[PDB]
Amino acid sequence: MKAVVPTGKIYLGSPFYSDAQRERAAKAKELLAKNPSIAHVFFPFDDGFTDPDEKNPEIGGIRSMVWRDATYQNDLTGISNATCGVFLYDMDQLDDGSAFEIGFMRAMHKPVILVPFTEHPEKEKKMNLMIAQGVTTIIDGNTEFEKLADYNFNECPSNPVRGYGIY
Amino acid sequence: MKAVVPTGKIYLGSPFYSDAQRERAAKAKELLAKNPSIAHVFFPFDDGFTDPDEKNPEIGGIRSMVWRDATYQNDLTGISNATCGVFLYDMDQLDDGSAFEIGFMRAMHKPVILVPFTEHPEKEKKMNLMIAQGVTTIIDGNTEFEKLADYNFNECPSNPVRGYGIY
Amino acid sequence: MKAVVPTGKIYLGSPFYSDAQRERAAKAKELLAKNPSIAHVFFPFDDGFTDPDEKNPEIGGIRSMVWRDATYQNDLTGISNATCGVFLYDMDQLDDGSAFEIGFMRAMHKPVILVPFTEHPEKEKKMNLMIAQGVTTIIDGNTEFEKLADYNFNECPSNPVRGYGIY
Amino acid sequence: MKAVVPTGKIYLGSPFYSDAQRERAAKAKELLAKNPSIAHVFFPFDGFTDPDEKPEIGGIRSMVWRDATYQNDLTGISNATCGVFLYDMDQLDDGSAFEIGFMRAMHKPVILVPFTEHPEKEKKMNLMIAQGVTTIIDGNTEFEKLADYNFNECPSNPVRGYGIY
Amino acid sequence: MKAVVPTGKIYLGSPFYSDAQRERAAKAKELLAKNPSIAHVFFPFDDGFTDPDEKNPEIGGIRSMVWRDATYQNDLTGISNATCGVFLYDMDQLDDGSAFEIGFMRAMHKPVILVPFTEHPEKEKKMNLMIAQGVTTIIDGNTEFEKLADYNFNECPSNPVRGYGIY
Amino acid sequence: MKAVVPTGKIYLGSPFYSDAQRERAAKAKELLAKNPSIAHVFFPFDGFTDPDEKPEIGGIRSMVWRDATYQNDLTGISNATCGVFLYDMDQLDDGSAFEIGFMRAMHKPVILVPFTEHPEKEKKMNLMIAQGVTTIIDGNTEFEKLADYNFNECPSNPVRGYGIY
Ligand SMILES: Nc1ncnc2c1ncn2[C@H]1C[C@H](O)[C@@H](CO)O1
Ligand SMILES: Nc1ncnc2c1ncn2[C@H]1C[C@H](O)[C@@H](CO)O1
Ligand SMILES: Nc1ncnc2c1ncn2[C@H]1C[C@H](O)[C@@H](CO)O1
Ligand SMILES: Nc1ncnc2c1ncn2[C@H]1C[C@H](O)[C@@H](CO)O1
Ligand SMILES: Nc1ncnc2c1ncn2[C@H]1C[C@H](O)[C@@H](CO)O1
Ligand SMILES: Nc1ncnc2c1ncn2[C@H]1C[C@H](O)[C@@H](CO)O1
């Protein structure tokens, strides 16, 4: 039913560093910030943990166990606090980090909104079975990205993946 | 202690095929609506999923796998987002769907408010052990229905089932 | 693939107040006993807890909180130790204890084998959505009871519920 | 990242026996009460009454009271988004430890707020508590950080500087 | 029912370093090794992880994050693999590590066997509510230590804590 | 610590598309088959048949087949005590990653067995995989360790030497 106050706590999962992926993330935030059902949105790449005991932090380099633990935990905490996950899923360059989080969230029985993106719309539509079945709601990033703004995150109505070939 | 904002998110479980069951649900919603500790209430039968590929869907009839998965997931999603469960539990015609849900919620360690209803208030009081022990708070539907309007859903104070024979 | 040793640990859930229910349980045990994939089977009604402080305990009567907690925990313990659930599910007199258990087990992501029994094989086939979608494998009790003797409990191959109307 | 509404739901776990512990809990509540990221705080000692219990604190309690009270706490843990533990380093509270392990098994964040009146002793911590806790806020030197900590996201802060037994 | 092969996988939780505590642990192993229902016993202090990148490992000293992570995980893994936990619980010098594991295991719905030990049998019998309620079976270390040898770990029958004052 | 009977129940997760992947899975099975600590190994590709599916691999599959097959895998994960993932570092398999995250959320141990045919590229790993996995066994240089690894206790071996993106 209608919520008395915003209840949606979003874990915004998404790959980063890549030009198009950052743009998607940025646009996702705007859209979500426009959603009245959202009480909070957590994006893993926003703020980060700084290990004072880490000389020259190499983004993409080895990285200390403390930073790794703290960063990984910040994400698990976001997943823990969240009521649902929204994943800007790159269908051209699959991100195992995001896939990991999708699996983790489904094991917690939390709803997962898949927002698939492809720069090759002409190519065959295929999806790993685990993603196609694990995801509870799909919102095409290429055609329905805007929906993230209207989607009722207080209840996260499901929408099973369909139309994708499965290997 | 006193909450700054309503935090109770209720998964209102209930059978919904008899007139009496739906009337209780209606009444439950009204009472819950008057509780200042509630941020949101989810009732499984309020919306529903529509499978476009499902021709002439009938209730009680063979449903498409897609509709089944979508609908079942909407309930698990409601359970996941909820902080507690409130079950309008029909003691005369046991509902296995509600029982399944109570079990699911308890496995998740979530408090479960049982609200038993019987059209035979004078008959023997017996309850299955799993329900009697599984529920954390009991509010008699026959004589205490109305406290749903005042119960503190921010903390869901416990009230063990007592006075029922166990078989 | 082929297991070096039986690994299937079955939580055999079942009502156990009618003669027909206990006869199915008896039969189920015998069949399960012949399955080489089974390492262990737990039946909730086999042993039992005795509360010394409980004077003249009667079945269906008011039981001590200690007995209730001990007995309920023995079942949750059985569910925890089990790799899968096998429910001799009475379709004529729905058992909420079994339903609660099926829900509990599924919340734990454990496979659940439903073995439906009805004294009216010719009547309508209807099942609650939560049970129909919650169970992972269905083995008709009326006509396929005996495959419990051969089912591979090391892997519990899935067999979705189909052919039942959903209400 | 900025919350539209406070979402932090705190389970304030803590021993409530010595006067010192009672004082810490009192302060914590006051401090948490000023944190704008908190929507609710649950303190287990703010109880259930067994109408059939003819009862002495520390005495034999009825199983009903025991069940109801234990559940009230698990319920608080279930509803909570994170745990804040006024952790007595001098008189170890196994109840609090239990709850910490419980919360972590649920993958929830745990903010450890240790207290020690014996600075003279080597700062040591059980491995399980050291690795289980996700954020540490020294109760003797950083107690006040509870009024500002962002419980909407519970930023991690691994335990360090503590010898592990 | 009777298991076809040993099914009990024990997570043997216990404090260490202390003279009496090591002795208890040593005796526990002997007793358990004599139990036909046990398939495996994991004791956290037996073998350990060696961090090649750890200069002079100080047992009780700071210790690297890698060692801490690996060691902590070895314990969580033992808890994960185990079907039940057996805790040699020191009532004189409370161990929060053990209490942590008890809470962790109960959250996973696994049975927990408490084996309390005290060197001051004359002192008041008291137990924290969380331990007294969380534990599913108590076997007095001081009087029934031997039972660990007969206890059926394939089913872990419960035995609620009683007789202990609760603060 | 010595098991009375093998208790290791392995969920052998892995892509099964390229011939190289098919070869690795084939070897892994053979290797695991010699490990005395293993009681059972589950390989998802060893399938369900939808009698109502009139079916092409890679094509649109019926929802029944999808559900049954996906569940067969979750069932394998549920029954498993640990996961062994023939992790293709060249062509990332999101299915395997999903399963790894799923298993860790269940607190189960995950043995990562990475494979790369491009040693020339900087050994890098997504943080989630690097921190999620509990034990790593290089598939290109330690593949054989699978026949000796003690799956009864799955000893930890944190991921190191991998740049984290
Ligand atoms: N370095 C990192 N800092 C924070 N979060 C990270 C990092 N690497 C992976 N993740 C998680 C969050 C994304 O949803 C997904 C990106 O692959 O997995
Ligand atoms: N057809 C259905 N649509 C939506 N929810 C349903 C359905 N059947 C069962 N349920 C769940 C929700 C109720 O709490 C309870 C009713 O038995 O179990
Ligand atoms: N009195 C009882 N003793 C032991 N187990 C019991 C009891 N009542 C319900 N159960 C559980 C086990 C069955 O699978 C199912 C029977 O309804 O729920
Ligand atoms: N008597 C009690 N009433 C309510 N909660 C209690 C009690 N004893 C222990 N606890 C729980 C809550 C604390 O966080 C911690 C205190 O040891 O464990
Ligand atoms: N240093 C350690 N190595 C291995 N396991 C450890 C360590 N410290 C605590 N534990 C866990 C296991 C015990 O059951 C309990 C002892 O407090 O908590
Ligand atoms: N078509 C399929 N049949 C069975 N299992 C499958 C399928 N696709 C993905 N999986 C799961 C199992 C693998 O570990 C991993 C392969 O990507 O994810």
* List of chains touching C (3+ CB pairs within 8 A): B, D, E, F
Known binder of ligand: residue B17? no
Helix B65-81 with F63-79: angle, nearest 10 deg: 40
Q: Which atom of ligand 2 is nearest to the CA of B95?
A: 17
* Domain range F1-165, CATH architecture: 3-Layer(aba) Sandwich (3.40)
Q: What is the 3-state secondary structure (H, E, C) of chain E?
A: CCCCCCCEEEEEECCCCCHHHHHHHHHHHHHHHCCCCEEEEECCCCCCCCCCCCCCCCCCCCCCHHHHHHHHHHHHHHHHHCCEEEEEEECCCCCHHHHHHHHHHHHCCCCEEEEEECCCCCCCCECCHHHHHHCCEECCHHHHHHHHHCCCCCCCCCECCCCCECC
| Chain D residues closer than 8 Å to A70 by CB | 156-158
Neighbours of chain B (3+ CB pairs under 8 A): A, C, D, F
Residue ranges lining ligand 2, Cβ < 6 Å: B 13-15, 44-45, 71, 75, 95, 97-98, 101; C 128-130, 166
Which of the residues F23, F99, F122, F142 is marked catalytic?
Answer: F99
**Which residue's CA is the closest to the ligand 6 atom numbered 5?**
F44
Residues of B in contact with C163 (CB under 8 A): 62
Quickly count helices (H) and strands (E) in chain D. 4, 7
**Residue of F98, F104, F126, F164 to test ligand 1 pocket, by largest number of atoms within 8 Å of CB:** F126
Which residues of E lie closer than 8 Å to A, measured between beta carbons? 64-66, 69
Sequence ranges of the domains in chain E: 1-167
The backbone torsions φ and ψ at residue B55, rounded to the nearest 5 degrees and listed phi first, read: -80, 130
Amino acid in position F129:
I
- Report the distance separating Cα F42 and Cα C4, nearest Å: 12
Q: Which amino acid is at D90?
A: D
Taking the CA atoms of residue F98, residue A128, residue A13 and residue A156 in that order, the dihedral angle to the nearest 10 degrees is -100
Q: Write the Ramachandran bin of A52: left for phi over 0, alpha for psi from -120 to 50, otherwise beta.
A: alpha
Neighbouring C-alpha atoms within 13 Å toward the C-beta of C129: 28
Do residues D39 and E145 make contact, with C-beta atoms less than 8 angstroms apart? Answer: no
Distance, CA of A166 to CA of D127 (rounded, Å)? 45
Residues C95 and E130: their CA atoms lie apart, in Å, by: 32
The ligand minimizing its distance to the Cα of F58 is 6
Distance D38 CA to ligand 4 centre (A): 22
Q: Alpha-carbon distance F74 to F83, whole Å? A: 12
DSSP B57-90: --TTSPPPHHHHHHHHHHHHHHHHH-SEEEEEEE
Instruction: Please list the alpha-helical segments (H only) found in chain C.
Output: 19-33, 65-81, 96-107, 129-134, 141-144
Interface residues of chain C, partner chain F, Cβ below 8 Å = 1, 3-5, 7, 83-84, 108-111, 136, 154-160, 162
Tallying the residues shown for chain B, one arrives at 167
Ligand 3 probe mutation, C21, C22, C64, C75, most atoms within 8 A of CB: C75
In this complex, which chains have at least 3 CB pairs below 8 Å with chain A? B, D, E, F
- In 3D space, the residue among A55, A64, A119, A115 whose CA is nearest the CA of residue A93 turns out to be A119
Tokens describing residue C161:
């519920």
Nearest chain B residue to C106 by CA: give it.
B104
Rounded to whole angstroms, the Cα distance separating A98 from B69 reads 23
Joined tokens for residue F95: 């299915």
| E3, E4, E155 ranked by CB distance to C78: nearest | E155
DSSP secondary structure of A28-79: HHHHHHT-TTEEEEE-TTSS----TT-SS--TTS---HHHHHHHHHHHHHHH
Interface residue of E56, E68, E100, E131 to substitute, partner D, most D CBs within 10 Å? E100
Residue type, C25: A
A90 CB under 6 A from ligand 1?
no
Distances (CA, A) of E3 to A80, B125, C40, C81: 38, 38, 4, 12
User: Position of tokens 């009698």?
Assistant: F51
F84 beta partners: F12, F111
Asked if residue B167 belongs to a known ligand binding site, the reply is: yes
Chains C & D: contacts with CB separation below 8 Å = 8
Measure A102 CA to ligand 1 centroid, in angstroms. Answer: 12
Q: A44 CB under 6 A from ligand 1?
A: yes
Show residues of chain D in contact with B83, CB under 8 Å: 78-79
* Catalytic position from the list D30, D53, D56, D99: D99
- Which method was it determined by? X-ray
Task: Please work out, in degrees rounded to the nearest 5, the angle formed at the alpha carbon of residue C39 by the alpha carbons of C35 and C42.
Answer: 95
Closest to F4 (Cα-Cα) out of E7, E25, C8, C4: E7
State the DSSP code for A93: S
Residue C95 CA to ligand 3 centre (angstroms): 9
Taking the domain C1-167, which CATH number applies? 3.40.50.450
CB of A76 within 6 A of ligand 6: the answer is: no
Q: Which of B58, B101, B119, B155 is catalytic?
A: B101
Give F119→chain A minimum CA distance, Å: 17
Ligand 5 atom 14 nearest Cα: E13
Distance from the CA of B66 to the center of ligand 6, in angstroms?
20
Q: How far apart are CA E110 and CA B107, in angstroms?
A: 11
The answer to whether C109 and F77 are in contact (CB under 8 A) is: yes
The pair of three-digit structure tokens given for residue F100, joined into one six-digit string: 């790894």
